Each structure stands twice: as C-alpha cells, then as structure tokens.
C-alpha cells in the first residue's frame, strides 16, 4: 500500500517549551483577573460637584478609580 515514514526534525523541546510561558502567565494573571473583575462590581467612584471637603481637604486619594 501507499505508505512511507516522514522525517520531522525536532518537536519535543518546543513542546517542552511554550508551556512555561502559558503556565506561569496564568499563575499571577488569572488571580489578577478577579481583581479587575470583583473590584469593579463592589467598588467604584463618585461623582462630581464637589464636595467642599469641609475646611481642610482630603489627602492623596483625590483620584476616581478603585486601585488608583
């Protein structure tokens, strides 16, 4: 029958590689992904106008963002 044996050079090292990118990128990427998901749901910022801040204003944390 029509049959042979192909010759492919080297694939094991390239399959032993490409894991360690994709492994470790989820090891702290996906735990950081909830931090952009869960903190959106429960925490925001508001709003404008103004407030007058009492007498002395607030410190740093003048920003309008959860982690900033």
């Amino acid at each position: 029958g029509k049959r042979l044996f192909i010759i492919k050079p080297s694939g094991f090292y390239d399959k032993r590689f490409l894991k360690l990118l994709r492994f470790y990128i989820l090891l702290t990427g996906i735990p950081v992904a909830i931090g952009i998901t869960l903190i959106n749901v429960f925490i925001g910022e508001a709003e404008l106008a103004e407030i007058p801040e009492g007498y002395v204003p607030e410190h740093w944390e003048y920003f309008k963002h959860p982690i900033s």
Partner: protein
C-alpha cells in the same frame, strides 16, 4: 534615586560571597527584584516638575529612559553563559562585578542634577567597557580596536571641561538645571562659535555623524563572549543623550551653524545604510543599521520645536530593544557554527523552526508596521522635518526604501536549503536560547497600548 544605587551595590558582595556554581543563580535572582523598585517611586506627576531629593537627583523626570538600564544585568548573565564556562571561578566572579560596576555609574547618570556631575559620570565609564573589550574577545584586532574606542571619546570630551568650568564662573553656577532660569543669550561672534562647538562635539563622537564613525564597527565587530558588553555599548551610545539637557537652553539661539551638522548627518543617513548591503560579516551587518537610524535623532535634536521631541525620545528606546535583540540573534547561532560569515549559515529554517518567528518579529520592527513603538517614532520625525523644508521628505523617504531591502536580506539568507555539510548544528534552540530572546518583544509591543509613558515633557 533615594536608594536604587544602594541595593545595586549590595549585589556586588553577594557574588564572591557565594558558593560554587550557585553564583549564576544567586546573581540573577536578586537582580530582577530591582525592576519592581525601579518602577516604584518613579513615574510620578508630572506638571513642572519632580525635583527629587537633593544635589543627587532630578529623578529623570520628563525622560524616563532608566528602567531599560536595569533590565540588562538580569539579561546579560543568561546570555553570557554560552561560551564563558571554561575559565576560572576567580575570573567569573570578576566579569559579573565590573558589569554591575558599569550599572552603578549609569544610575547616577541620566539623572545627575547638574552638568558637571554629568561629565565626571559621563567619563566614569569607558574603563569597565575597555576591560570587556581587550580581555574576553576572540582573535586579534582587539587591541587597536581597544585604542580606537579611546582617543575619539576622550579627545572630544576634554574640551567639555574647558567650557563647563568656564560657565561655572561666568553666570552664577551651573550646579542646578533649575538655576538655569537666568540665561543670557549667545549671539554671533568669533568666540561664541567655539563655545557652541566644543560643548557639542564631544556628544557627536558617541552618537556618530557620518564622519568620525570609524570606531563603531571596530568595538562591535570584535566583541565579547555573547554580545555581553555589546548590549551595554548600544545603551551607552544612546546614553549620550545629554544634548537634550544642554542644547534646549544654554546657547539656545544658535541655529546659524547647525547646517554643517544637518547636511552631513542627513545625507550620511542615506548613504551609511546603503553601504552595508554588501557586508559579509553578520555582526557588522547590524553594526551599520545602528549608525543610520541613530543618526536620525541628530537631525531631530538640532531641529527644535516638538512633535520632534515626541519622536526623538521614542527613537532612543526604539532600537534600544530592537538592536539589542538583533545582537542576541547573532550571539546565538554562532555557538553552533563557529563563523560569523553570513554565507556559511545556509540550509536553515528547517532545522530550527521555533526561532523563525524570532527572526521575523525582529526584522518586522525595522519595516516597523505602524502600531509599534517604531513608526510612532519616525512619523513624528517625518512630520517635524517636513516643516523645516519640504524637500527633506525625499532623502528620508529613500531612507525608508533601502532599509526595507536591507532588513529582509538578513532574513532571506536563511530561507534556503540542502545544507551540504554540518554534522554539527544539532542543538534545537534550548530553553535559555528562547528565554533571553524573549523579554525583548514582550515589552516592545506591550508599550504600544498606552505609550504616554514614552514621551518627553514635551
């Protein structure tokens, strides 16, 4: 820098203090930890300005440029281990310590708070580079190239001292760039030519014109273990940026004699890239790419008025990451075939498939494929020097033409076959060979999302 210099000197009594072959893993471990701390207090705000602590730092406020200086000691130790591991541990401890000792002075440089603190640190290098050039190379023409690396850099930099000490006792004191509010202008005279010229010419000797580039394919051609100071010598060339600190002020009104620096470096740009397409040494092929589109900044600094400083800053760290990796592509694929002759390495692209992407995504940044950090840099320079004179689109356009045919000529020499020889060349580009080839494009295309971090004041 509060203490960035103070941890990175503490790296130095860690290497010799260690055990046996653990000396590679102990140094690369802690050296990555500064990259959080380097980012940490820096990148603050931001509207006129961040004077940092004292007479030791203006924080490198509007030109960041310094995070890239701190990648490299945990980038070169993983690169240098290819052919270094035959010497003694007593010298292997040396070559790590002087490399850290090169990063120490660069950290107080780029910030430097002054102009006379700059120079003594501008010249505090060139001693630890020269040790990496003369010892630890290959066969000869190291030693004359060790002398061509001097005597251009040092002949030019001594008339800085004559002029910088001249300013320090003429108008107040130069000690701060923020005591530079009182600046008298510099008119047309016969002594004020030389005050402009001696203060400028020592920067031209590092970022070359078309003339006096004669030392640049000497030190890079004959070069250490695996590009090990060649990665440093490409930062050091763009670490002669201080023309951005000087010439913005401090003789601001001399464009009268910019023209022999324009035409020499604008026609030289169209020729010194054209003179490389017949190269036969592979590491000298890249060494002339580094001449050409580095010299585009010299017509981008002398032409003032930003929409150029938008781009002239982005071009300093455009090929800070590109031309580093191209040397790393050539520091690899020399461990397997022991020649740098570009003829000999044919029969490739079948044997090493995984690094075909590393060739292209390197050479696709010179074609530069507009959403990168590259054609956001050139297209501000193009739209700047258009407004100088309209005719400059011609030479700079043919600059874009020839480097397209130039970059692919290094790619397409590997797309051939039948290999004719080579019972060696077996090693299928191991885990280290892709790791130190990564961390180049991984920040290079990442910063294209929000590249407001890469901008001048401006």
């Amino acid at each position: 820098m509060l203490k960035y210099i103070i941890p990175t000197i503490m790296l130095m009594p860690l290497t010799w203090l260690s055990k046996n072959n653990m000396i590679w893993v102990n140094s690369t471990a802690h050296s990555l930890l500064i990259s959080f701390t380097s980012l940490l207090l820096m990148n603050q705000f931001g509207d006129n300005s961040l004077n940092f602590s004292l007479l030791f730092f203006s924080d490198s406020l509007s030109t960041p440029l310094l995070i890239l200086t701190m990648w490299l000691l945990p980038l070169m130790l993983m690169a240098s281990q290819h052919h270094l591991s035959k010497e003694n541990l007593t010298r292997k401890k040396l070559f790590i310590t002087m490399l850290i000792s090169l990063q120490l002075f660069l950290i107080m440089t780029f910030t430097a708070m002054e102009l006379i603190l700059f120079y003594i640190l501008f010249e505090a290098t060139l001693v630890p580079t020269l040790i990496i050039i003369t010892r630890w190379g290959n066969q000869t023409e190291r030693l004359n190239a060790g002398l061509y690396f001097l005597f251009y850099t040092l002949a030019g930099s001594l008339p800085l001292l004559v002029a910088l000490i001249y300013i320090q006792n003429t108008v107040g004191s130069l000690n701060f760039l923020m005591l530079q509010y009182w600046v008298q202008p510099v008119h047309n005279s016969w002594s004020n030519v030389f005050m402009w010229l001696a203060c400028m010419m020592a920067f031209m000797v590092k970022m070359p014109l078309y003339g006096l580039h004669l030392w640049l394919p000497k030190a890079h051609v004959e070069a250490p273990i695996a590009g090990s100071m060649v990665l440093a010598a490409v930062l050091l060339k763009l670490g002669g940026y201080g023309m951005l600190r000087i010439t913005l002020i401090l003789n601001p009104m001399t464009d009268f004699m910019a023209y022999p620096f324009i035409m020499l470096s604008l026609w030289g740009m169209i020729m010194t890239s054209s003179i490389c397409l017949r190269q036969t040494d592979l590491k000298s092929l890249i060494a002339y790419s580094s001449v050409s589109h580095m010299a585009l900044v010299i017509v981008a600094i002398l032409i003032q008025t930003p929409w150029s400083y938008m781009g002239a800053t982005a071009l300093m760290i455009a090929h800070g990451l590109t031309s580093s990796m191209l040397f790393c592509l050539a520091n690899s694929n020399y461990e397997r075939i022991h020649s740098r002759t570009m003829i000999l390495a044919r029969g490739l692209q079948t044997l090493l498939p995984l690094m075909a992407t590393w060739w292209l995504l390197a050479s696709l940044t010179n074609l530069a494929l507009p959403p990168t950090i590259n054609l956001i840099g050139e297209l501000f320079v193009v739209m700047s020097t258009f407004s100088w004179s309209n005719i400059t689109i011609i030479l700079m356009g043919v600059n874009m033409v020839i480097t397209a045919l130039y970059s692919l000529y290094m790619l397409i020499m590997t797309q051939r076959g039948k290999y004719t020889y080579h019972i060696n060349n077996i090693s299928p580009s191991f885990t280290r060979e892709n790791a130190l080839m990564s961390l180049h494009i991984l920040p290079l295309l990442l910063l294209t999302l929000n590249p407001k971090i890469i901008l001048g004041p401006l």
